[PDB]
């Protein structure tokens, strides 16, 4: 497992960089246990049950839908994602994308003027990139 790049550098240079003129609102790399590996300045503080609900939907897709994607006390409505890989949520003009790696979770929160496809693109790429090292 490569230890040469800091998780702070990953979120700063691959999650919060400019894409199509816009920026993510907040981003974080978090373990499946709930330990945040790195997070931007304005990323919310999770609650333990919120992460467990996220993880239960990854284990059985469609189980978080009645409850909603709860991140930092904020309720997002779950929308379509990839089973066992990506969980997405919408809160009006904003939203969030949670991408699953082998050991961690990549999370990006956007608000207008950012499209959901751009938040999807950046977050999921770093997800796939780290899955391909075993991370």
């Amino acid at each position: 497992d490569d230890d040469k790049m800091s998780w702070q550098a990953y979120v700063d240079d691959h999650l919060m960089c400019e894409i199509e003129g816009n920026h993510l609102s907040a981003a974080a790399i978090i373990g499946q246990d709930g330990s945040v590996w790195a997070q931007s300045a304005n990323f919310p503080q999770f609650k333990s049950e919120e992460i467990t609900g996220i993880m239960s939907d990854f284990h059985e897709p469609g189980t978080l839908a009645p409850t909603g994607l709860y991140i930092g006390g904020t309720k997002y409505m779950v929308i379509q994602g990839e089973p066992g890989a990506v969980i997405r949520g919408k809160k009006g003009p904003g939203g969030v994308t949670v991408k699953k790696t082998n050991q961690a979770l990549i999370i990006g929160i956007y608000d207008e003027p950012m499209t959901p496809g751009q938040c999807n693109m950046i977050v999921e790429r770093l997800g796939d990139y780290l899955i391909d090292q075993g991370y």
Epitope: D13, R125, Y129, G134
Partner: antibody
Framework: EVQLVESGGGLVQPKGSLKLSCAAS????????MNWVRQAPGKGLEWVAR??????????YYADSVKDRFTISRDDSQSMLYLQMNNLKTEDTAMYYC???????WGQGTSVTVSS | DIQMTQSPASLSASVGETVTITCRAS??????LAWFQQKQGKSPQLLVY???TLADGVPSRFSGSGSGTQYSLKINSLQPEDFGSYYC?????????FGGGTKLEIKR
């Protein structure tokens, strides 16, 4: 510790087929995505294929140059990578390396000449 | 597809001098760029992975720089073992295209 050893290269007449192999040792092969990269005799490098881990259903991505002719596969039970080549053209004559993820470790290379 | 254009093609410098090889993408690769050095008769070797992260066993005279569509590799205090060619490769989206290469001769 990490060592990639290619094999299978050789001389093949045009429109032929050939199956290169790559043996990986020194790391958990199942947790990494693998590449095939080739270099023409005097020219530069060109990326031709990539395969993913079991987590993403062993997805495969090819270059348009070799899009409908080449096939990349892997046997994680034996820590082996394969490149299947069909309808070999003159433009395929090159040296072929297996590459791990973004290029941390390359292989010795196996040479392939397509000529009459 | 994101094609990449490297420059210059050839560079010659006496030992002790400093050179930079610039590499440009047709779109934002969002700092998913790696640098490889290759010598005649041998396989390439990774110098800088991602925009600025040096790989294991690489001298610190290699500074990886860049952002957006333009990146560069700086070699300060050039040493005689730095001859060869240098290729840049992006990993944003498939195809993971290589570059044209920059052959470095050592003025002597």
């Amino acid at each position: 510790e990490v060592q990639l050893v290619e094999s299978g290269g050789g001389l093949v007449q045009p429109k032929g087929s050939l199956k290169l192999s790559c043996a990986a040792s020194g790391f958990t092969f199942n947790t990494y995505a693998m590449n095939w990269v080739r270099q023409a005799p005097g020219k530069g490098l060109e990326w031709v294929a990539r395969i993913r881990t079991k987590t993403n259903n062993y997805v495969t991505y090819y270059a348009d140059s070799v899009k409908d002719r080449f096939t990349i596969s892997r046997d994680d039970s034996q820590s082996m990578l394969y490149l299947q080549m069909n309808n070999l053209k003159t433009e395929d004559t090159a040296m072929y390396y297996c590459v791990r993820h973004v290029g941390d470790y390359w292989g010795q290379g196996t040479s392939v000449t397509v000529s009459s | 597809d994101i094609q990449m254009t490297q420059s210059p093609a050839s560079l010659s410098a006496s030992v002790g001098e400093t050179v930079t090889i610039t590499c440009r993408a047709s779109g934002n690769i969002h700092n998913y760029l790696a640098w490889f050095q290759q010598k005649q008769g041998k396989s390439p070797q990774l110098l800088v992975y991602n925009a600025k992260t040096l790989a294991d066993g690489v001298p610190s005279r290699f500074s990886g720089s860049g952002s957006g569509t333009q990146y560069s590799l700086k070699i300060n205090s050039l040493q005689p073992e730095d001859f060869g060619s240098y290729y840049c490769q992006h990993f944003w989206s498939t195809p993971y295209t290589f570059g044209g290469g920059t052959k470095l001769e050592i003025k002597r």
